[PDB]
Design a protein around this ligand. Structure first.
Ligand SMILES: Nc1ncnc2c1ncn2[C@@H]1O[C@H](COP(=O)(O)OP(=O)(O)O)[C@@H](O)[C@H]1O
Length: 234
């Protein structure tokens, strides 16, 4: 249900992700034209910036499935098991093509037996892509420093899109979500909180709200005021 409309900002990202969108909607068109798409896009940027959200939106913008997983979980699994699932991930994916496959914390694999077996499996799976393969693999990373070099070779994640901290609207949206469940006072202006927290990321905001919630309860107050919010921040 997420489209590029539900994504605040990310001008270039969406621009660069159009070719992908178009392709997923009518892959047969691109097949007939003899055109080849990258099919391996890595979103690079800090945590709580909207990478999973943008990816999901890319699958929605093309009204196609969005199959996810986490390079982190794969590594958490017993050796052999992780690679077994990487296998299951792409198998299921081909079953439901076109669509998007989203591997999160891909540096879990890129950056130990488990980690190696999962990496090789992923690589073989991605190298097994034929032209007629209508799957676009999107991965996410915030630690590009540790990402394994092989993942970035042409044919794999040979395309990257940097993603920065959310804009004023994107900040307001996160605050609004996380504000859900909290007794805000009348003076609370979430739009304003959004305006005066430039640079903040998902965590900075999710936390600020919580800390603002503690000063409230810790002082016995039954409602978080704009003050608490402003204080919680510093
Ligand atoms: N532009 C935006 N519009 C709406 N929500 C956003 C936006 N940017 C971030 N968010 C919120 O912040 C959370 C951050 O997680 P995610 O989008 O997966 O990115 P990341 O991989 O950087 O953590 C999302 O679940 C979403 O609810």
């Amino acid at each position: 249900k997420v489209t590029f409309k539900d994504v605040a900002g990310a001008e270039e990202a969406k621009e660069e992700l159009k070719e992908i969108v178009e392709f997923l909607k009518n892959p047969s068109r691109f097949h007939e034209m003899g055109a080849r798409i990258p099919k391996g896009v890595l979103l690079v940027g800090p945590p709580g910036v909207g990478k999973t959200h943008l990816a999901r939106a890319v699958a929605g913008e093309a009204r196609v499935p969005f199959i996810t997983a986490s390079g982190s979980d794969f590594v958490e699994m017993f050796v052999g098991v992780g690679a077994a699932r990487v296998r299951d991930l792409f198998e299921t994916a081909k079953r439901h093509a076109p669509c998007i496959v989203f591997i999160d914390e891909i540096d879990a694999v890129g950056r130990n037996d488990e980690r190696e077996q999962t990496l090789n499996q992923l690589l073989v799976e991605m190298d097994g892509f034929e032209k007629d393969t209508a799957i676009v693999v999107m991965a996410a990373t915030n630690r590009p420093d540790i990402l394994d070099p092989a993942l970035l070779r042409p044919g794999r994640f040979d395309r990257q899109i940097a993603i920065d901290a959310p804009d004023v609207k994107g900040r307001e949206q996160i605050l609004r979500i996380h504000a859900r469940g909290k007794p805000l006072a009348e003076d609370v202006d979430l739009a304003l909180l959004a305006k005066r927290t430039p640079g903040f990321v998902g965590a900075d905001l999710e936390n600020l709200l919580n800390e603002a919630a503690l000063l409230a309860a810790r002082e016995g107050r039954r409602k978080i005021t704009m003050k608490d919010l402003e204080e919680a921040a510093s």
